[PDB]
């Protein structure tokens, strides 16, 4: 019983103290100071620096779906690193409800999925929780409790045709509110009225989807913005989206992808 | 990590218009949310009112709402707070503190401004 | 609208001594979707502005010293500094942030003793 040195330098008084550290039985053990095979090594294991997130086919498209049948990918087995923030191109906004971007880097998710559309310019706002309009009613409802990021820039030179770019299209009328993340793409003829007009598009029965009106010679309000909705999950198996980390060697302490584990 | 510095310390008579600034140095600066904190002589901290940088979406407390105004100017990064009319009970430190979204907790904190209205 | 208590107000505690402060919430404050409480605990020195100490009320900030350790559930939560040390005396808030406004507590001034 020789050799118990002072671990710390933090001062404390009659406060039992279990610590892990190097002493004679150097070895590691574990002890407790008065003021079973113990893990020899520690190893860490995060997925290889390379196999990236296809981030650039989700933001560098060379088209972006309609708003009422917007285009939903999902993304995992990547290290994600999210330089995307910083605006090497143009990003007129970046929101990020409930999570912090700067500090994502640290954390490990699961299936982050990517949903890609085209608004106009006003109805940008109305992509945010809680909102109440043509788009957040019939078109593309968030829930309430949102844990994501909304990216919207502007492309007027893409979208934006001398003669008109009328292939963008979103749905006017509508029988209900849209249940959180459900894509309706009918092309029914709706019953405005008791005319029972068997889809003759008569008086009183409308076309529910209507196209937009885009031109270079045009305001700032009604111009053609590309937004991108990141949303955040996390269920259970987290061995799927993980922020860059250095590894070590594999032989004990582990940590796989922060009773059966598959090496990544 | 971007650092906010304020605009210094101003002293003012009863009945004057008031305006402080908060200027935001630093890369990664495009999804700082700008909070206001006003701590008044040896007391707790009270939250304000909160503002995103461009969009200029402003979210205010009850008890101070409509009693300031917060607005934003996103060409130089900075944000403003102004008082139309300060009162003589307004004498108190304010810090402005920028969270990276909301629902953040506000880790960047800047110096802070005191205002003193009295003879 | 969802005001905080904490308790005590003052202790006194001598160096090298455990110090427990607890925070008691009207609502609880548990983001169904990420299952993280959102409340955060904060450090202030006299004459300078706060600084951030724990976040969701269990991690630490980089650079915060294991000293300083948080815990609870519900909407009963504590922070608990294993030993105190002569840079420690300072008032402590706790703050939720899961909806808007957002509230603050009391603050906790922590003095050594002789």
């Known amino acids: 019983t020789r050799g118990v040195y002072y671990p710390d330098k933090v001062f404390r008084s009659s406060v039992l103290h279990s610590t892990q550290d190097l002493f004679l039985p150097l070895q590691p053990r574990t002890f407790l100071l008065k003021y079973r095979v113990q893990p020899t090594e520690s190893i860490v294991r995060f997925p290889n620096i390379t196999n990236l997130c296809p981030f650039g086919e989700v933001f560098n498209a060379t088209r972006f779906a309609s708003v009422y049948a917007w285009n939903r990918k999902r993304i995992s087995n990547c290290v994600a690193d999210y330089s995307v923030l910083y605006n090497s191109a143009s990003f007129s906004t970046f929101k990020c409800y409930g999570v912090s971007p700067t500090k994502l880097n640290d954390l490990c998710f699961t299936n982050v999925y990517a949903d890609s559309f085209v608004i106009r310019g006003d109805e940008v706002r109305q992509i945010a929780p809680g909102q109440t309009g043509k788009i957040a009613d019939y078109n593309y409802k968030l829930p309430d409790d949102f844990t994501g990021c909304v990216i919207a820039w502007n492309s007027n030179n893409l979208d934006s045709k001398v003669g008109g770019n009328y292939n963008y299209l979103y749905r006017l009328f509508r029988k209900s509110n849209l249940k959180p993340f459900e894509r309706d793409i009918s092309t029914e003829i709706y019953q405005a009225g008791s005319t029972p007009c068997n889809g003759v598009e008569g008086f009183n029965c409308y076309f529910p989807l209507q196209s937009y009106g885009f031109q270079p010679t045009n305001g700032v309000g009604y111009q053609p913005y590309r937004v991108v909705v990141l949303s955040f999950e996390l269920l259970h198996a987290p061995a799927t989206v993980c922020g860059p980390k250095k590894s070590t060697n594999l032989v004990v302490n582990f940590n796989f992808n922060g009773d059966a584990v598959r090496d990544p | 990590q971007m650092q906010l510095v304020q605009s210094g310390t101003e002293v003012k008579k009863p009945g004057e218009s008031l305006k402080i600034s908060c200027k935001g140095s630093?890369?990664?600066?495009?999804?700082?949310?700008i909070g206001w904190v006003r701590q008044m002589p040896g007391k707790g901290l009270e939250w304000m009112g909160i503002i995103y940088p461009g969009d200029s979406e402003t979210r205010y407390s009850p008890s101070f709402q409509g009693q300031v105004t917060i607005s934003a100017d996103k060409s130089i990064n900075t944000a403003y707070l102004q008082w139309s009319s300060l009162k003589a009970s307004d004498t108190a430190i304010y810090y402005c503190?920028?969270?990276?979204?909301?629902?953040?907790?506000?880790?960047?904190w800047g110096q802070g401004t005191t205002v003193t209205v009295a003879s | 609208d969802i005001q905080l208590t904490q308790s005590p107000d003052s202790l006194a505690v001598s160096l090298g001594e455990r110090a427990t402060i607890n925070c008691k919430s009207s609502?609880?404050?548990?983001?169904?979707?990420?299952?993280?409480?959102?409340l955060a605990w904060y450090q202030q020195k006299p004459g300078q502005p706060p600084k951030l100490l724990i976040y969701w009320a269990s991690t630490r900030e980089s650079g915060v010293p294991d000293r300083f350790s948080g815990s609870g559930s519900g909407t009963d939560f504590t922070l608990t500094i294993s030993s105190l040390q002569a840079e420690d005396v300072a008032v402590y808030y706790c703050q939720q942030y899961y909806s808007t406004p957002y509230t603050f507590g009391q603050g906790t001034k922590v003095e050594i003793k002789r």
């Open positions: 609502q609880s404050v548990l983001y169904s979707s990420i299952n993280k409480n959102y």
């Open positions: 630093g890369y990664g600066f495009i999804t700082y949310w």
């Open positions: 503190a920028g969270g990276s979204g909301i629902s953040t907790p506000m880790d960047v």
